[PDB]
Design an enzyme around this catalytic site. Sequence first.
Site, short mmCIF file in Angstrom:
data_model
loop_
_atom_site.label_atom_id
_atom_site.label_comp_id
_atom_site.label_asym_id
_atom_site.label_seq_id
_atom_site.Cartn_x
_atom_site.Cartn_y
_atom_site.Cartn_z
N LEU B 15 30.80 37.03 47.57
CA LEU B 15 31.45 36.15 46.60
C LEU B 15 30.50 35.14 45.98
O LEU B 15 30.73 34.67 44.86
CB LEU B 15 32.64 35.43 47.24
CG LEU B 15 33.61 34.80 46.24
CD1 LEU B 15 34.24 35.87 45.36
CD2 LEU B 15 34.67 33.98 46.95
N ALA B 16 29.42 34.80 46.69
CA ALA B 16 28.42 33.89 46.15
C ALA B 16 27.57 34.56 45.09
O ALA B 16 27.51 34.12 43.94
CB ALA B 16 27.55 33.35 47.29
N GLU B 211 48.62 49.92 40.08
CA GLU B 211 47.21 50.14 39.84
C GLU B 211 46.91 51.63 39.99
O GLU B 211 47.41 52.27 40.93
CB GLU B 211 46.34 49.32 40.81
CG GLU B 211 46.27 47.83 40.49
CD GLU B 211 45.50 47.03 41.52
OE1 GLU B 211 45.77 47.20 42.73
OE2 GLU B 211 44.63 46.22 41.13
N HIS B 235 51.25 36.79 44.61
CA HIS B 235 51.30 36.83 43.15
C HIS B 235 52.70 37.16 42.64
O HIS B 235 53.27 36.42 41.83
CB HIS B 235 50.27 37.84 42.63
CG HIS B 235 49.85 37.59 41.22
ND1 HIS B 235 50.03 38.52 40.22
CD2 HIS B 235 49.24 36.53 40.64
CE1 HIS B 235 49.56 38.04 39.08
NE2 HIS B 235 49.07 36.83 39.31
N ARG B 337 48.21 51.27 35.01
CA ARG B 337 47.80 49.90 35.31
C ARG B 337 48.72 48.97 34.54
O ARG B 337 48.40 48.48 33.45
CB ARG B 337 46.33 49.69 34.96
CG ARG B 337 45.80 48.30 35.29
CD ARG B 337 44.34 48.33 35.70
NE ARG B 337 43.68 47.05 35.47
CZ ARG B 337 43.82 45.97 36.24
NH1 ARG B 337 44.60 46.02 37.32
NH2 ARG B 337 43.18 44.85 35.94
N1 LIG Z 1 40.74 39.90 48.30
C1 LIG Z 1 40.38 38.97 49.17
O1 LIG Z 1 41.19 38.44 49.96
C2 LIG Z 1 38.93 38.54 49.20
C3 LIG Z 1 37.91 39.26 48.53
C4 LIG Z 1 36.60 38.80 48.60
C5 LIG Z 1 36.29 37.66 49.32
N2 LIG Z 1 37.31 36.98 49.97
C6 LIG Z 1 37.02 35.74 50.75
O2 LIG Z 1 35.89 35.15 50.17
C7 LIG Z 1 35.17 34.46 51.20
C8 LIG Z 1 33.69 34.77 51.02
O3 LIG Z 1 33.32 35.90 51.83
P1 LIG Z 1 32.39 37.07 51.27
O4 LIG Z 1 33.19 38.34 51.27
O5 LIG Z 1 31.95 36.68 49.90
O6 LIG Z 1 31.12 37.16 52.21
P2 LIG Z 1 30.85 36.78 53.77
O7 LIG Z 1 29.72 37.62 54.28
O8 LIG Z 1 32.16 37.02 54.44
O9 LIG Z 1 30.49 35.25 54.02
C9 LIG Z 1 29.40 34.68 53.39
C10 LIG Z 1 28.60 33.91 54.38
O10 LIG Z 1 29.49 33.50 55.44
C11 LIG Z 1 28.71 33.28 56.60
N3 LIG Z 1 29.42 33.96 57.69
C12 LIG Z 1 30.03 35.24 57.64
N4 LIG Z 1 30.61 35.58 58.81
C13 LIG Z 1 30.38 34.47 59.65
C14 LIG Z 1 30.72 34.19 60.97
N5 LIG Z 1 31.44 35.10 61.73
N6 LIG Z 1 30.35 33.00 61.54
C15 LIG Z 1 29.66 32.16 60.77
N7 LIG Z 1 29.27 32.28 59.52
C16 LIG Z 1 29.64 33.46 58.96
C17 LIG Z 1 27.26 33.85 56.30
O11 LIG Z 1 26.34 32.80 55.95
P3 LIG Z 1 24.92 32.76 56.65
O12 LIG Z 1 24.76 33.91 57.61
O13 LIG Z 1 23.79 32.67 55.64
O14 LIG Z 1 25.07 31.47 57.44
C18 LIG Z 1 27.58 34.77 55.13
O15 LIG Z 1 26.43 34.97 54.30
C19 LIG Z 1 35.80 34.87 52.56
O16 LIG Z 1 36.55 33.83 53.08
C20 LIG Z 1 36.66 36.08 52.19
O17 LIG Z 1 37.87 36.13 52.89
C21 LIG Z 1 38.60 37.41 49.91
#
Ligand SMILES: NC(=O)c1ccc[n+]([C@@H]2O[C@H](COP(=O)([O-])OP(=O)(O)OC[C@H]3O[C@@H](n4cnc5c(N)ncnc54)[C@H](OP(=O)(O)O)[C@@H]3O)[C@@H](O)[C@H]2O)c1
Lengths: 426, 426
Positions: B15-16, B211, B235, B337
């Site tokens: 997401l970043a 979808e 939603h 869709r």
């Molecule tokens: N449809 C959806 O519901 C949806 C879709 C996409 C994203 N999201 C949400 O968006 C957020 C971002 O997540 P992401 O998918 O972009 O990537 P991510 O890999 O889940 O998290 C990004 C960073 O979180 C840290 N991290 C991950 N797991 C960890 C753990 N168990 N303990 C500590 N730090 C941890 C790491 O940072 P470092 O290792 O560098 O410290 C990692 O680079 C999440 O909360 C996810 O639920 C939701």
Amino acid sequence: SDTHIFIIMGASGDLAKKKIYPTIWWLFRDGLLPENTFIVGYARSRLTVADIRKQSEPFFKATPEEKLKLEDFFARNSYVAGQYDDAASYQRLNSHMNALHLGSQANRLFYLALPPTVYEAVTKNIHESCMSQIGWNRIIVEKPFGRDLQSSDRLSNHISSLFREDQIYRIDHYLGKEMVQNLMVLRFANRIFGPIWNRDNIACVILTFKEPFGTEGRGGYFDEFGIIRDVMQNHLLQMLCLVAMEKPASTNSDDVRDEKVKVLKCISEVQANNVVLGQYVGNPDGEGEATKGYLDDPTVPRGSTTATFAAVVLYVENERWDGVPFILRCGKALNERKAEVRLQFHDKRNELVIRVLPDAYERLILDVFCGSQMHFVRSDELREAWRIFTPLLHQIELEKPKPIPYIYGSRGPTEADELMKRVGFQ
Amino acid sequence: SDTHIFIIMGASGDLAKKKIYPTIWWLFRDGLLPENTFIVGYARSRLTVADIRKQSEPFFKATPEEKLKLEDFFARNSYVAGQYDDAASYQRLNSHMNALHLGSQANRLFYLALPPTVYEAVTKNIHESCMSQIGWNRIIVEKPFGRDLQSSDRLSNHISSLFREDQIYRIDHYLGKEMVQNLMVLRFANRIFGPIWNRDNIACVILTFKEPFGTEGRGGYFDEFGIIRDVMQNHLLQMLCLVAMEKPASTNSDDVRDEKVKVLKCISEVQANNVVLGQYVGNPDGEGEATKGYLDDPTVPRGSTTATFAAVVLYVENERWDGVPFILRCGKALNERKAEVRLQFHDKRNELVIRVLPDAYERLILDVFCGSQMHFVRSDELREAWRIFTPLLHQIELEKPKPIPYIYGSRGPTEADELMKRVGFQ
Ligand SMILES: NC(=O)c1ccc[n+]([C@@H]2O[C@H](COP(=O)([O-])OP(=O)(O)OC[C@H]3O[C@@H](n4cnc5c(N)ncnc54)[C@H](OP(=O)(O)O)[C@@H]3O)[C@@H](O)[C@H]2O)c1
Ligand SMILES: NC(=O)c1ccc[n+]([C@@H]2O[C@H](COP(=O)([O-])OP(=O)(O)OC[C@H]3O[C@@H](n4cnc5c(N)ncnc54)[C@H](OP(=O)(O)O)[C@@H]3O)[C@@H](O)[C@H]2O)c1
């Protein structure tokens, strides 16, 4: 009662052999006519029933297995000959109708498939010769219902001096096989969205009638009317009424037609500044009837300024609607076959869109049989439409302004969209 | 003020680099961010800004002529490393933010791009270390907002014990680039058709989210939620609220969200008899991802009873709506869709259909910048949705009923249409 006679004043013309005989056939085949219904035609040309059959069976879509029903149908058929202002001829017609089984007591439905130039005569003789003494008498008149306020007024006064309004049935059925569903769904929409449809929520209402085909070798008949008399003054105005009307007192035909008349009595006469006229020219790059324009039709007189496209702005002037523009946009030979009503809201601006087994004309014949006058313009209602559109039509026929030329296939002359923008559309 | 700091708690995840850096880039390039806005990321992995750039520039759609703006952008960028429950790390973050130009007085916007399993820690340390003393502090939390009423309640109580509701911004932005226009036009429709939308004119309301694509090699993440937690509970329920809500006291975010909460507080807990669940199987005659089903995705555990299609009937229970069924129908891997809301009227039955430059997610970031909480589910509002859907989800996870198998491309399992018919749809 149970016995009906369908008099067809004029069986030797197109509308007779092309439609009304086919349509009544189609209603009998499907068992929709009353069981004791006789079909009796009448014109000057002396001919047998079998001649009508030999020259109008092509249009029935008959199949070998269903032809016994057709033999019974033509057993119901009969035809007599006579003039339109000969008292002895109408006396022969009346005696022949009385001769039929229970014809003395039977209902009588007169379909005037004649050019209105003879109506004054026919409606007279019928009134004094052929009206039933026990059953009801209903007359179906046909377009044109005059061409201006004066001619329409004289004709309607003559007809209504002989028949009550519950006997006069002004039919109109040349704009599609879904013509009745239009008004039906628009009435339902007025009954549903009644409280919303005010000047507070709506900024502009439009009513569009587009057709993609030209006159198609028949611009000669269309030239004597114009697109205002062919689509706007009758149909688009009726659906404007259906949109802007108040809640009727009930579901009777006369109450809702009273509401339509009340709506019409609030529209002032349209003037040329709120009017954009257009004539379709041949498309150079298209093919087929697209290559020919309006003036390329041989039946069209040379130098015709007749408009085949019109955009007109009207205003209902009461408390529910005030300053709310009703933009009637119609035109032959366009981009789409669309018939819709779009109401734009006080805020990109949001709008509500209303777009469109008994099939129109058949539905209409059945309404006059049952007796519901719902979809027929009532005599006092017509006068108001003619009053609205008469000064503009007189001005057009007097000054003959050259209609804006527009390319066959275009949405319309740009001046129409400019007119919409001037009043507040975007 | 004029100085803003955009803290990104977790710059090393998808997401970043896939979105929030690209989206903030896109808002800066178009001059939509405040002129004095710094972007400061923060995660445990020690790395330079240039590493984020080398691994996230692909997603920016950069063109050679616009890259000087990008150099200024990355001058605004900075990044520090530390743990999520280390007080010294948050102290280093706070001192680094204070070191920036006017960082002492600046507003601070924390984007928790982290799995919620660490939220409890992060939200704590921020509260005691990194909150600004002069400017406002707003935190953007991310899905999942728990998985049932109990977990969501514990998480929301923890977060709201540290930040006022005007500081909590629950964002949801994974269902299309037009996600905000949906709720906007539905609010406008509630404001327009307010008086009509009663139990008197409407017999049934439906809310559809179809979808045409499957899980596409990512059914492993979807398997832990289910189609109810992914589309319906968040939603579709929000737009149900927007349809059934009363007229708000004003246009403030909190008044309309109060109306949405009032709507939610009238919906009782859904039970299995009003629920139809479905799972998509591979299409034998289709091609591409059409050949694979839900269980053919390698990331999906074998024997998964997770539903990828749901049809649920709810009822608002007050005087405006009573017995009026709201049919929420959604499903991955379908025929179209389509995202629409159809209100069927008391009479073929007639229905009103509502179908759908700042683009959704960008619009949402800009709302949290300006401060309008309009489109973010409020903490007390969420609890009601979770209460509505929690007993059914507990029952599904406990008994694990096999979802109805439906063919990939079908409209849905026939039991859904049968359910609609049972309640009164036709
Ligand atoms: N449809 C959806 O519901 C949806 C879709 C996409 C994203 N999201 C949400 O968006 C957020 C971002 O997540 P992401 O998918 O972009 O990537 P991510 O890999 O889940 O998290 C990004 C960073 O979180 C840290 N991290 C991950 N797991 C960890 C753990 N168990 N303990 C500590 N730090 C941890 C790491 O940072 P470092 O290792 O560098 O410290 C990692 O680079 C999440 O909360 C996810 O639920 C939701
Ligand atoms: N869009 C429209 O407005 C539209 C379209 C089609 C039809 N119509 C109306 O439908 C009606 C039926 O007309 P039609 O087009 O089907 O055919 P028609 O030829 O106009 O009339 C049918 C019969 O009328 C009699 N007739 C015609 N001109 C006459 C005259 N000058 N004097 C006396 N009798 C005359 C003839 O009967 P005999 O020679 O056998 O005595 C003729 O066979 C007309 O009123 C016409 O306006 C309107």
